[PDB]
Amino acid sequence: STGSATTTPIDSLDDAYITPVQIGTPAQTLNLDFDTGSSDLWVFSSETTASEVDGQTIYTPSKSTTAKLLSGATWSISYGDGSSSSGDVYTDTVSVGGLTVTGQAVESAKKVSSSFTEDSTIDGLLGLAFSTLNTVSPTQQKTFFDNAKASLDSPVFTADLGYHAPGTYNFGFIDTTAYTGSITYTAVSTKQGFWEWTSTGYAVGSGTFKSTSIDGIADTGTTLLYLPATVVSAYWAQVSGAKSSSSVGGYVFPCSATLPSFTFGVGSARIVIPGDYIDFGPISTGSSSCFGGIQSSAGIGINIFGDVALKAAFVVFNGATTPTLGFASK
Numbered sequence: 360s361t362g363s364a365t366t367t368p369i370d371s372l373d374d375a376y377i378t379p380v381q382i383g384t385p386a387q388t389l390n391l392d393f394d395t396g397s398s399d400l401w402v403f404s405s406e407t408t409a410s411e412v413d414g415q416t417i418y419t420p421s422k423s424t425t426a427k428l429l430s431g432a433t434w435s436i437s438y439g440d441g442s443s444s445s446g447d448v449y450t451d452t453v454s455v456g457g458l459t460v461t462g463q464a465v466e467s468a469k470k471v472s473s474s475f476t477e478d479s480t481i482d483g484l485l486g487l488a489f490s491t492l493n494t495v496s497p498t499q500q501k502t503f504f505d506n507a508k509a510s511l512d513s514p515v516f517t518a519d520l521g522y523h524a525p526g527t528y529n530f531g532f533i534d535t536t537a538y539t540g541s542i543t544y545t546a547v548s549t550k551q552g553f554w555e556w557t558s559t560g561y562a563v564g565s566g567t568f569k570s571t572s573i574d575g576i577a578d579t580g581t582t583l584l585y586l587p588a589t590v591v592s593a594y595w596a597q598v599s600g601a602k603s604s605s606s607v608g609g610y611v612f613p614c615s616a617t618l619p620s621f622t623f624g625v626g627s628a629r630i631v632i633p634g635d636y637i638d639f640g641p642i643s644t645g646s647s648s649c650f651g652g653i654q655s656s657a658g659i660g661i662n663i664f665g666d667v668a669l670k671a672a673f674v675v676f677n678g679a680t681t682p683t684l685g686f687a688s689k
Contacts, residue, residue, distance in 0.1 A: 362458025383423030394580030414479030
C-alpha cells in the first residue's frame with residue numbers, strides 16, 4: 360500500500376504545515392501537524408476542556424462506530440517550546456492520503472496549553488519520530504508510520520514541504536519526479552528516539568564550505584533551523600545590522616536586508632536554503648525589525664533541522680531495520 364497527502368502552510372510565514380487526516384467511521388477529517396520530532400497522534404476532541412477550544416475541529420469518539428476506549432491509558436506530552444497537552448486514548452481507524460491503519464491509538468486531549476488553544480488552524484499532531492518516544496501509559500503505543508510500515512510497498516515516508524506553498528507527505532514510495540539529481544542517504548541514530556543525523560558542514564552565501572560535523576534532528580514540527588552559536592553568528596555576520604536580541608529571543612535583522620543563502624552538507628552533497636526562506640517577517644506588526652529563520656540551539660541541547668532546512672529538500676525518512684535519512688535538492 361501507499362498514501363499521499365498534501366500538506367499546507369498554516370499562514371503566510373510557513374510557521375507550520377497541516378495535513379488532512381481521516382479518523383473514525385464515518386470519517387472525521389482533522390488537520391494535523393505532522394511532526395517527525397515526536398511520537399504521539401493527539402487531537403482536539405469532544406473531551407477537551409471547552410474553554411481551551413477556540414475554532415479547532417474536534418474528534419468525537421462517540422460518533423465513530425470503530426472507536427474503542429483504550430482502557431486505563433493516559434498520555435501527557437511537553438514540547439520544546441514549553442507547550443503541552445494530555446488526555447486519554449481511543450483506538451480507531453486512521454487514514455492519511457488513502458493509506459489506512461486500523462487500531463491506531465488516537466490520543467484525545469482533555470487539556471491543551473494556551474499556544475494550542477490560540478492556534479485555530481491545528482487540530483492536533485501526528486507524530487512520526489520513533490515509537491520509543493510515545494507517551495501513552497501504562498502501555499506505550501505505536502506511531503501511524505510504525506503501524507502502517509509492514510503494509511507499505513517500501514518502509515519509508517517522504518516530506519516535501521513547500522516554501523510559501525503546499526507540499527506533500529508520501530508513505531510507502533519515493534516519487535522520483537519530485538526532486539532533482541540524486542538522493543544522498545546518511546546514517547541515523549535512534550538512541551534518543553529522533554531522526555538524528557550528522558551534517559557534514561555548512562556555507563554562508565557564496566562563501567567557502569566549512570567541513571564540520573553537526574549532529575541534529577530532522578524535525579518537521581519545528582519551524583526554524585537551530586544550529587550551534589558559532590555557525591549562527593557566522594551567518595548573521597553577513598547581514599548588515601543583524602544582531603541577537605535578548606528581549607526578542609533571537610537574531611533579528613533589518614527588514615530592508617537581502618539575506619544570503621545557507622548551505623548544509625549531507626555527506627558530499629549540499630542542500631542550499633535560499634535567503635528568502637530565512638525571513639520570518641516583522642517581530643510585531645509594522646516593525647522594521649524582522650525575525651531570523653536561523654537561530655542558536657545553545658539553549659536547547661540539540662541542533663534542529665526544522666522546516667527552514669527541510670523545505671529546501673526532498674527528504675526520505677527510511678524506516679528500514681536500520682533507518683537512514685535521504686536528502687535531495689528539488
